Design a protein around this ligand. Structure first.
Ligand code: MG
Ligand code: MG
Ligand code: MG
Ligand code: MG
Ligand code: MG
Ligand code: MG
Ligand code: MG
Ligand code: MG
Ligand code: MG
Ligand code: MG
Ligand code: MG
Ligand code: MG
Ligand code: MG
Ligand code: MG
Ligand code: MG
Ligand code: MG
Ligand code: MG
Ligand code: MG
Ligand code: MG
Ligand code: MG
Ligand code: MG
Ligand code: MG
Ligand code: MG
Ligand code: MG
Ligand code: MG
Ligand code: MG
Ligand code: MG
Ligand code: MG
Ligand code: MG
Ligand code: MG
Ligand code: MG
Ligand code: MG
Ligand code: MG
Ligand code: MG
Ligand code: MG
Ligand code: MG
Ligand code: MG
Ligand code: MG
Ligand code: MG
Ligand code: MG
Ligand code: MG
Ligand code: MG
Ligand code: MG
Ligand code: MG
Ligand code: MG
Ligand code: MG
Ligand code: MG
Ligand code: MG
Ligand code: MG
Ligand code: MG
Ligand code: MG
Ligand code: MG
Ligand code: MG
Ligand code: MG
Ligand code: MG
Ligand code: MG
Ligand code: MG
Ligand code: MG
Ligand code: MG
Ligand code: MG
Ligand code: MG
Ligand code: MG
Ligand code: MG
Ligand code: MG
Ligand code: MG
Ligand code: MG
Ligand code: MG
Ligand code: MG
Ligand code: MG
Ligand code: MG
Ligand code: MG
Ligand code: MG
Ligand code: MG
Ligand code: MG
Ligand code: MG
Ligand code: MG
Ligand code: MG
Ligand code: MG
Ligand code: MG
Ligand code: MG
Ligand code: MG
Ligand code: MG
Ligand code: MG
Ligand code: MG
Ligand code: MG
Ligand code: MG
Ligand code: MG
Ligand code: MG
Ligand code: MG
Ligand code: MG
Ligand code: MG
Ligand code: MG
Ligand code: MG
Ligand code: MG
Ligand code: MG
Ligand code: MG
Ligand code: MG
Ligand code: MG
Ligand code: MG
Ligand code: MG
Ligand code: MG
Ligand code: MG
Ligand code: MG
Ligand code: MG
Ligand code: MG
Ligand code: MG
Ligand code: MG
Ligand code: MG
Ligand code: MG
Ligand code: MG
Ligand code: MG
Ligand code: MG
Ligand code: MG
Ligand code: MG
Ligand code: MG
Ligand code: MG
Ligand code: MG
Ligand code: MG
Ligand code: MG
Ligand code: MG
Ligand code: MG
Ligand code: MG
Ligand code: MG
Ligand code: MG
Ligand code: MG
Ligand code: MG
Ligand code: MG
Ligand code: MG
Ligand code: MG
Ligand code: MG
Ligand code: MG
Ligand code: MG
Ligand code: MG
Ligand code: MG
Ligand code: MG
Ligand code: MG
Ligand code: MG
Ligand code: MG
Ligand code: MG
Ligand code: MG
Ligand code: MG
Ligand code: MG
Ligand code: MG
Ligand code: MG
Ligand code: MG
Ligand code: MG
Ligand code: MG
Ligand code: MG
Ligand code: MG
Ligand code: MG
Ligand code: MG
Ligand code: MG
Ligand code: MG
Ligand code: MG
Ligand code: MG
Ligand code: MG
Ligand code: MG
Ligand code: MG
Ligand code: MG
Ligand code: MG
Ligand code: MG
Ligand code: MG
Ligand code: MG
Ligand code: MG
Ligand code: MG
Ligand code: MG
Ligand code: MG
Ligand code: MG
Ligand code: MG
Ligand code: MG
Ligand code: MG
Ligand code: MG
Ligand code: MG
Ligand code: MG
Ligand code: MG
Ligand code: MG
Ligand code: MG
Ligand code: MG
Ligand code: MG
Ligand code: MG
Ligand code: MG
Ligand code: MG
Ligand code: MG
Ligand code: MG
Ligand code: MG
Ligand code: MG
Ligand code: MG
Ligand code: MG
Ligand code: MG
Ligand code: MG
Ligand code: MG
Ligand code: MG
Ligand code: MG
Ligand code: MG
Ligand code: MG
Ligand code: MG
Ligand code: MG
Ligand code: MG
Ligand code: MG
Ligand code: MG
Ligand code: MG
Ligand code: MG
Ligand code: MG
Ligand code: MG
Ligand code: MG
Ligand code: MG
Ligand code: MG
Ligand code: MG
Ligand code: MG
Ligand code: MG
Ligand code: MG
Ligand code: MG
Ligand code: MG
Ligand code: MG
Ligand code: MG
Ligand code: MG
Ligand code: MG
Ligand code: MG
Ligand code: MG
Ligand code: MG
Ligand code: MG
Ligand code: MG
Ligand code: MG
Ligand code: MG
Ligand code: MG
Ligand code: MG
Ligand code: MG
Ligand code: MG
Ligand code: MG
Ligand code: MG
Ligand code: MG
Ligand code: MG
Ligand code: MG
Ligand code: MG
Ligand code: MG
Ligand code: MG
Ligand code: MG
Ligand code: MG
Ligand code: MG
Ligand code: MG
Ligand code: MG
Ligand code: MG
Ligand code: MG
Ligand code: MG
Ligand code: MG
Ligand code: MG
Ligand code: MG
Ligand code: MG
Ligand code: MG
Ligand code: MG
Ligand code: MG
Ligand code: MG
Ligand code: MG
Ligand code: MG
Ligand code: MG
Ligand code: MG
Ligand code: MG
Ligand code: MG
Ligand code: MG
Ligand code: MG
Ligand code: MG
Ligand code: MG
Ligand code: MG
Ligand code: MG
Ligand code: MG
Ligand code: MG
Ligand code: MG
Ligand code: MG
Ligand code: MG
Ligand code: MG
Ligand code: MG
Ligand code: MG
Ligand code: MG
Ligand code: MG
Ligand code: MG
Ligand code: ZN
Lengths: 118, 59, 7, 204, 131, 122
RNA sequence: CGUGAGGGAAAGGUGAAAAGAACCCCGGGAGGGGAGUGAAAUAGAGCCUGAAACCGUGGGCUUACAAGCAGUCACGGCCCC
RNA sequence: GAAUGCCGGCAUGAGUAACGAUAAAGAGGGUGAGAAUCCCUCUCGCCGUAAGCCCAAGGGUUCCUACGCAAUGGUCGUCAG
RNA sequence: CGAUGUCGGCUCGUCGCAUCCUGGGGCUGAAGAAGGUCCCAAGGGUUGGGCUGUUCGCCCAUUAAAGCGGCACGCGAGCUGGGUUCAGAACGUCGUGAGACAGUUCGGUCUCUAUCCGCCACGGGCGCAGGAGGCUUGAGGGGGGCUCUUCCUAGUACGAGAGGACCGGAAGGGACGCACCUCUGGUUUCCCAGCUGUCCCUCCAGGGGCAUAAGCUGGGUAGCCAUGUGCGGAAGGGAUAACCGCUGAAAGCAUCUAAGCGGGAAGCCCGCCCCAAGAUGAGGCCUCCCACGGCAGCCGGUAAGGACCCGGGAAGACCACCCGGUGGAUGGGCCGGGGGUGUAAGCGCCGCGAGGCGUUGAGCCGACCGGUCCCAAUCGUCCGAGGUCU
């Protein structure tokens, strides 16, 4: 049973899955848009949305909280100076997932794009 | 355990009856409103890159 | 594997 | 023989006569009478109750006609209460008085595919002393060449729950008509938000 | 509907607001109404609050005390009608929410671990100066 | 929650110090005993020259349990030991003092003399 | 295959003649479709003949209340000559 | 027509078990008819009295480079002993 | 004998009744209470331990009782392997010996993949003369079915006394069953905190990895849960068993019977709970659609409707089921509440310093109860009646 349980497992143990979210978060904030599998993309939304929101708050505490996940002061600077002001008046919903039409050849996996919002 | 084993060869009739559930369903495709190419619903059009009215992707 | 012994 | 459709709200407890009383709160009323089953027409006696108003932007034409013949707004659920013939056109919580006893029918929580130990309280096997991969297994399921088969009704693993269950003879602790609320002592089948049915008890 | 509010509405007839605020590590005296044979008397129970589990109207708290050589723990519904009053006997300063570890401590180890919460003590004396 | 094999402290002056439950005298097959229940016990440790000695098979009523017991008012109580008082076949204590608190449940179960002898009743 | 003494296989056939298919077409290739050769190409090299098990496509009759060593006897229905 | 016969072919089990250490992956860029699987870059994880380095046996071109992908590689393959 | 695994145990049942208990009875050398004996009765129940491989049995402590048998001495493609039942070794014994012993002693490989029937669950198909969306009847099944203690009646009837009822009423238990998470008590793989060693970011400060597939430790929401909570066994109606009668001949009397009529069990039927019209005997009611175009058929286009796809769900292996799809709160974000942790960072002050204090119940914060269109359920596609015959 899984009754009212939140959060995918993605066939990874607890530290692999966490490192998976951090590395996707680093990649999406680096490039603005990435392709993954649909289930990975859907989980990345909330993980990134929380980090963008903290950058919107912009204080030193919020920068240190984000650096636990993102580690790269350069990237965090970009998130605070360039990315976060884009969303000052947007209350959540900083990311979007759109499904792609063609599966990956080698395992048939449904793919999706994840991107930051305008 | 003690290694269970087919007692009889399955007949052609019985083999094929088991496969009565094996036909594929053809893919569900809708026409893309922009370029009219057929594509899976709820996916970014792979032919012109449009979805929800706007360009999204480079093809 | 030791055979079963019906002895 | 009165009854009413309801929703399981959730459990809490209250204090009555220096005693803690566990209760399940049920939002029951109100239930428009939509159809009456008559011995002349239907062969038996019952009321078709409605419950929860529905967006007409979701009620097809076969259903809209049915509601229309009764002059009722469209409701989300239609359920019959057998051998209930209320005088009015609407059933509310006020048909129950604190102190009466009720039976409550709900859809139990679904365990999906359940093992023999959870489904049937089987004992399993030993967890050591040489037990070989059978710690949760049922053991023997029969005899030998006579009868050479397994009884119908044999308890085995399989789906468990999400089935109709009636818990019988619960006390009505309070009726809060302003809020269409029913307080019932004890536990009631199903999840919060699930549909239940509250009937006057059959125990004497 | 809102089921949470309906439950809170059902419970609102029994919620109390006359009791003092306290924290795990505080020393408290609970005047509790007891039924003994035929009569009902108020029996006090004084000890250390070692746990408060919160759930709105359903929050409860646990008080530990030594009595004639034997440790006694007593669990109280925080909104029970059988509680006459709660008297703050002392503020202690804890570092965690649950104080189960004091079951295995000596009486002087407990005193060294839960020193007086001088701040909340001064805030108590700061109030009670009403006029 | 006392069962066969459970050791219990003796909260009286009968001389016994530790008894081990061998039976829960509550029906045909009760699994557990709680405060107010009677057990049969073997005396595992005693002080010399007392009323009861090591090896005696005795009856005792349970007066304290580490498993907390619940009460209709929604409260519960819990002691640090499991304790019993040795009794005779009329439920009367075979000692003359009871040491430590006892549960108020003993009262309605018919153990009034033990309740009065107790220094505190909780 | 065996350290070794030693053990010890499978595997023949286009056509009279290579005339062994230039060139074009789809394809990354494989493979094919035309063109061409030949008396013949289901003789096209994975090549004489090309059985049987086995697999498949198309058609006729039949089958979802039914008890079977699967046939046999009878009668009826449908399809074919 | 039977010899648990012999040699070969082809079925059934079955789209089933399995795909060989639970050290672990993610993304961007590139190449190509084709890329989860090749190359490059960043992020992550694992060994570190080794899962690193140097000899001796044994193996015998497997070394380096260009061109390849039918088969071999337990998938794929543009990569490769 | 081209193999039907062989004791005991564990697990899982099911059946017989020559009945261990509970229910109903007759006789008693039945005053009462408690027995003895036999009859009816298989609905349910029939405990935990010490010894031994043990079956059995003896013992301890209880109990209403601690029943006896069948199912390949039920059940090793379900487990065990103590015994028995190979090879080693030893003792007693026998044999000159090699060796031998239902004599003993210590040790000794128990085979991942279920084809068919059967069983537990779940889909797909077609049928149920028009086609649909709902709500239902219940043929027929299944589940369940136990019992004790105290009190009142009443210290009454009975009894010299000891003792001690029927009938009727009341309360409280044991085990078992279904459901449940308010409370109690668990778990809660990252929800919070503290801690060590090391490497790293960025030197301090603050952090991150790794030490497990949580490094360790203290806590812990929702969910899933029992040790926790509610509720169940019935009541009642009907027909009976042994047994007891009423009226009553044959047979002037007698006779429960030959005509007829009563009473009478935990058992039987119904009643309770669950499944259930593939109940092909395919049921009933309410509502909706409609006679489309072309040579009981045909083929196309539609109707009421349905499916697909997508967002999901205390529903779930998959499928099914249920909700929702911008006319929207379905998931994700965000916000408020709850809840957990237990006073963040930064700065100021005190201390040589480890630290302490204030800011501050601070900061962080899964799932719970809600709000909010900020993000995604875009756009659509495909089926789908024209109703045989007297
Ligand atoms: Mg499960
Ligand atoms: Mg489930
Ligand atoms: Mg699990
Ligand atoms: Mg959820
Ligand atoms: Mg996660
Ligand atoms: Mg999930
Ligand atoms: Mg896995
Ligand atoms: Mg894995
Ligand atoms: Mg993996
Ligand atoms: Mg996998
Ligand atoms: Mg780790
Ligand atoms: Mg880019
Ligand atoms: Mg990618
Ligand atoms: Mg991926
Ligand atoms: Mg969040
Ligand atoms: Mg700053
Ligand atoms: Mg965080
Ligand atoms: Mg999409
Ligand atoms: Mg797709
Ligand atoms: Mg590939
Ligand atoms: Mg592949
Ligand atoms: Mg086996
Ligand atoms: Mg096995
Ligand atoms: Mg095995
Ligand atoms: Mg096998
Ligand atoms: Mg065979
Ligand atoms: Mg087979
Ligand atoms: Mg065959
Ligand atoms: Mg055939
Ligand atoms: Mg075939
Ligand atoms: Mg088959
Ligand atoms: Mg199949
Ligand atoms: Mg197909
Ligand atoms: Mg809840
Ligand atoms: Mg009240
Ligand atoms: Mg329900
Ligand atoms: Mg329902
Ligand atoms: Mg359910
Ligand atoms: Mg199991
Ligand atoms: Mg169960
Ligand atoms: Mg269980
Ligand atoms: Mg067990
Ligand atoms: Mg067991
Ligand atoms: Mg177990
Ligand atoms: Mg185990
Ligand atoms: Mg096994
Ligand atoms: Mg194991
Ligand atoms: Mg088994
Ligand atoms: Mg057998
Ligand atoms: Mg057999
Ligand atoms: Mg067997
Ligand atoms: Mg048979
Ligand atoms: Mg189900
Ligand atoms: Mg049920
Ligand atoms: Mg009751
Ligand atoms: Mg309301
Ligand atoms: Mg709630
Ligand atoms: Mg103290
Ligand atoms: Mg203190
Ligand atoms: Mg300290
Ligand atoms: Mg301190
Ligand atoms: Mg302070
Ligand atoms: Mg004591
Ligand atoms: Mg003592
Ligand atoms: Mg003595
Ligand atoms: Mg001794
Ligand atoms: Mg002695
Ligand atoms: Mg005593
Ligand atoms: Mg006293
Ligand atoms: Mg060789
Ligand atoms: Mg050899
Ligand atoms: Mg060689
Ligand atoms: Mg040889
Ligand atoms: Mg030739
Ligand atoms: Mg010729
Ligand atoms: Mg060419
Ligand atoms: Mg070409
Ligand atoms: Mg080409
Ligand atoms: Mg190539
Ligand atoms: Mg070619
Ligand atoms: Mg071709
Ligand atoms: Mg060609
Ligand atoms: Mg020619
Ligand atoms: Mg040709
Ligand atoms: Mg030919
Ligand atoms: Mg030829
Ligand atoms: Mg020739
Ligand atoms: Mg040939
Ligand atoms: Mg040929
Ligand atoms: Mg051929
Ligand atoms: Mg073919
Ligand atoms: Mg054919
Ligand atoms: Mg055909
Ligand atoms: Mg039939
Ligand atoms: Mg037919
Ligand atoms: Mg047939
Ligand atoms: Mg034949
Ligand atoms: Mg025939
Ligand atoms: Mg004939
Ligand atoms: Mg022959
Ligand atoms: Mg042969
Ligand atoms: Mg053979
Ligand atoms: Mg032979
Ligand atoms: Mg051969
Ligand atoms: Mg050959
Ligand atoms: Mg062969
Ligand atoms: Mg062969
Ligand atoms: Mg072959
Ligand atoms: Mg075949
Ligand atoms: Mg094959
Ligand atoms: Mg084969
Ligand atoms: Mg196959
Ligand atoms: Mg498959
Ligand atoms: Mg199989
Ligand atoms: Mg499988
Ligand atoms: Mg295998
Ligand atoms: Mg393998
Ligand atoms: Mg597999
Ligand atoms: Mg592997
Ligand atoms: Mg390993
Ligand atoms: Mg390691
Ligand atoms: Mg990445
Ligand atoms: Mg990758
Ligand atoms: Mg990659
Ligand atoms: Mg790539
Ligand atoms: Mg690009
Ligand atoms: Mg590749
Ligand atoms: Mg490729
Ligand atoms: Mg890889
Ligand atoms: Mg590379
Ligand atoms: Mg990166
Ligand atoms: Mg080192
Ligand atoms: Mg060399
Ligand atoms: Mg070599
Ligand atoms: Mg290759
Ligand atoms: Mg290849
Ligand atoms: Mg290839
Ligand atoms: Mg080549
Ligand atoms: Mg290969
Ligand atoms: Mg390959
Ligand atoms: Mg391999
Ligand atoms: Mg290439
Ligand atoms: Mg190389
Ligand atoms: Mg034999
Ligand atoms: Mg054989
Ligand atoms: Mg044989
Ligand atoms: Mg054999
Ligand atoms: Mg055999
Ligand atoms: Mg056992
Ligand atoms: Mg009998
Ligand atoms: Mg009896
Ligand atoms: Mg009797
Ligand atoms: Mg008598
Ligand atoms: Mg007598
Ligand atoms: Mg008798
Ligand atoms: Mg019986
Ligand atoms: Mg029985
Ligand atoms: Mg022992
Ligand atoms: Mg034993
Ligand atoms: Mg024995
Ligand atoms: Mg035997
Ligand atoms: Mg014996
Ligand atoms: Mg008796
Ligand atoms: Mg007895
Ligand atoms: Mg026994
Ligand atoms: Mg037997
Ligand atoms: Mg038996
Ligand atoms: Mg027999
Ligand atoms: Mg025998
Ligand atoms: Mg025998
Ligand atoms: Mg046996
Ligand atoms: Mg057996
Ligand atoms: Mg075995
Ligand atoms: Mg056995
Ligand atoms: Mg077998
Ligand atoms: Mg078997
Ligand atoms: Mg067998
Ligand atoms: Mg053995
Ligand atoms: Mg022996
Ligand atoms: Mg041998
Ligand atoms: Mg010896
Ligand atoms: Mg000798
Ligand atoms: Mg001799
Ligand atoms: Mg001699
Ligand atoms: Mg001799
Ligand atoms: Mg021997
Ligand atoms: Mg023997
Ligand atoms: Mg022998
Ligand atoms: Mg002998
Ligand atoms: Mg002997
Ligand atoms: Mg022996
Ligand atoms: Mg010996
Ligand atoms: Mg032995
Ligand atoms: Mg050994
Ligand atoms: Mg052994
Ligand atoms: Mg084994
Ligand atoms: Mg195995
Ligand atoms: Mg099978
Ligand atoms: Mg099978
Ligand atoms: Mg089968
Ligand atoms: Mg069969
Ligand atoms: Mg079957
Ligand atoms: Mg079906
Ligand atoms: Mg319908
Ligand atoms: Mg519906
Ligand atoms: Mg009817
Ligand atoms: Mg029905
Ligand atoms: Mg029926
Ligand atoms: Mg049937
Ligand atoms: Mg029945
Ligand atoms: Mg019964
Ligand atoms: Mg009396
Ligand atoms: Mg008397
Ligand atoms: Mg009575
Ligand atoms: Mg039972
Ligand atoms: Mg259950
Ligand atoms: Mg629950
Ligand atoms: Mg549950
Ligand atoms: Mg809760
Ligand atoms: Mg809880
Ligand atoms: Mg708790
Ligand atoms: Mg975290
Ligand atoms: Mg560190
Ligand atoms: Mg650096
Ligand atoms: Mg530092
Ligand atoms: Mg700090
Ligand atoms: Mg590292
Ligand atoms: Mg490492
Ligand atoms: Mg460890
Ligand atoms: Mg690791
Ligand atoms: Mg960590
Ligand atoms: Mg805990
Ligand atoms: Mg923990
Ligand atoms: Mg929790
Ligand atoms: Mg909780
Ligand atoms: Mg919970
Ligand atoms: Mg649960
Ligand atoms: Mg329980
Ligand atoms: Mg009756
Ligand atoms: Mg007469
Ligand atoms: Mg008479
Ligand atoms: Mg008669
Ligand atoms: Mg009668
Ligand atoms: Mg009478
Ligand atoms: Mg009667
Ligand atoms: Mg009864
Ligand atoms: Mg039903
Ligand atoms: Mg039907
Ligand atoms: Mg039905
Ligand atoms: Mg009909
Ligand atoms: Mg029908
Ligand atoms: Mg799902
Ligand atoms: Mg699914
Ligand atoms: Mg599914
Ligand atoms: Mg449906
Ligand atoms: Mg519903
Ligand atoms: Mg829908
Ligand atoms: Mg909709
Ligand atoms: Mg739509
Ligand atoms: Mg929403
Ligand atoms: Mg809604
Ligand atoms: Mg929301
Ligand atoms: Mg979700
Ligand atoms: Mg809060
Ligand atoms: Mg709080
Ligand atoms: Mg502070
Ligand atoms: Mg601070
Ligand atoms: Mg600081
Ligand atoms: Mg300073
Ligand atoms: Mg401090
Ligand atoms: Mg937050
Ligand atoms: Mg919050
Ligand atoms: Mg929140
Ligand atoms: Mg709105
Ligand atoms: Mg479209
Ligand atoms: Zn397009």
């Amino acid at each position: 049973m899984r009754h009212l349980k939140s959060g995918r497992k993605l066939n990874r143990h607890s530290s692999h899955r966490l490192a998976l979210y951090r590395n996707q978060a680093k990649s999406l904030l680096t490039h603005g848009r990435i392709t993954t599998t649909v289930p990975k993309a859907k989980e990345l939304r909330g993980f990134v949305d929380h980090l963008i929101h903290l950058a919107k708050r912009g204080d030193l505490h919020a920068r240190r909280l984000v650096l636990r996940d993102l580690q790269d002061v350069k990237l965090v600077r970009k998130l605070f100076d360039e990315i976060a002001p884009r969303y000052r008046d947007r209350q959540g919903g900083y990311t979007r997932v759109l499904k792609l039409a063609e599966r990956r050849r080698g395992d048939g996996a449904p793919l999706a794009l994840v991107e930051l919002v305008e | 355990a003690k290694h269970p084993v087919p007692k009889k060869k399955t007949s052609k009739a019985r083999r094929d009856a088991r496969r009565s559930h094996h036909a594929l369903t053809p893919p569900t495709l809708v026409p893309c409103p922009e370029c009219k190419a057929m594509k899976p619903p709820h996916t970014v059009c792979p032919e012109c890159g449009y979805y929800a009215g706007r360009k999204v992707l480079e093809v | 594997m030791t055979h079963s012994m019906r002895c | 023989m009165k009854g009413i459709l309801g929703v399981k709200v959730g459990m809490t407890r209250i204090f009555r006569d220096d005693r803690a009383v566990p209760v399940t709160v049920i939002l029951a009323g109100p239930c428009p009478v939509v159809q009456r089953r008559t011995p002349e027409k239907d062969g038996y006696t019952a009321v078709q109750l409605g419950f929860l108003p529905q967006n007409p932007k979701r009620v097809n034409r076969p259903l809209k006609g049915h509601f229309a013949k009764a002059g009722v707004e469209p409701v989300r659920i239609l359920r019959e209460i057998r051998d209930f013939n209320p005088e009015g056109d609407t059933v509310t919580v006020e048909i129950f008085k604190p102190g009466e006893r009720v039976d409550v029918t709900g859809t139990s929580k679904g365990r999906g595919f359940a093992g023999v130990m959870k489904r049937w309280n089987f004992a399993g096997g030993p967890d050591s002393h040489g037990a070989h991969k059978i710690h949760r297994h049922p053991g023997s399921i029969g005899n030998r060449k006579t009868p050479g088969r397994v009884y119908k009704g044999k308890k085995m693993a399989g789906h468990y729950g999400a089935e109709r269950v009636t818990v019988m003879n619960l006390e009505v602790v309070d009726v809060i008509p302003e809020e269409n609320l029913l307080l019932v002592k004890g536990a009631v089948p199903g999840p919060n938000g699930g549909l239940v049915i509250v009937r006057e008890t059959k125990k004497a | 509907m809102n089921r949470g509010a309906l439950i809170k509405l059902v419970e609102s007839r029994y919620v109390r607001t006359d009791l003092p605020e306290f924290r795990p590590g505080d020393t408290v005296r609970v005047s509790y109404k007891v039924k003994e044979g035929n009569r009902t008397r108020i029996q006090d129970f004084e000890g250390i609050v070692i746990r408060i589990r919160r759930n709105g109207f359903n929050t409860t708290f646990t008080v530990r005390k030594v009595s004639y050589g034997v440790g006694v723990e007593r669990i109280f519904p925080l909104h029970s009608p059988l509680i006459q009053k709660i008297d703050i006997v002392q503020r202690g300063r804890a570092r965690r929410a649950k104080l189960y570890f004091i079951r295995n401590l000596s009486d002087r180890e407990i005193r060294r671990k839960l020193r007086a919460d001088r701040k909340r003590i001064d805030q108590d004396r700061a109030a009670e100066r009403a006029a | 929650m006392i069962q066969p094999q459970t050791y219990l402290e003796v909260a009286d002056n009968t001389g016994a110090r530790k008894i081990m439950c061998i039976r829960v005298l509550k029906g045909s097959n009760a699994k557990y005993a709680t405060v107010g229940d009677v057990i049969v016990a073997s005396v595992k440790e005693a002080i010399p020259r007392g009323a009861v000695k090591e090896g005696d098979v005795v009856k005792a009523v349970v007066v304290r349990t580490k498993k907390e017991i619940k009460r209709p008012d929604g409260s519960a109580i819990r002691f640090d030991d499991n304790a019993a008082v040795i009794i005779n076949n009329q439920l009367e204590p075979r000692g003359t003092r009871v040491f430590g608190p006892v549960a108020r449940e003993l009262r309605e179960k018919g153990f009034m003399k033990i309740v009065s002898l107790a220094p505190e009743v909780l």
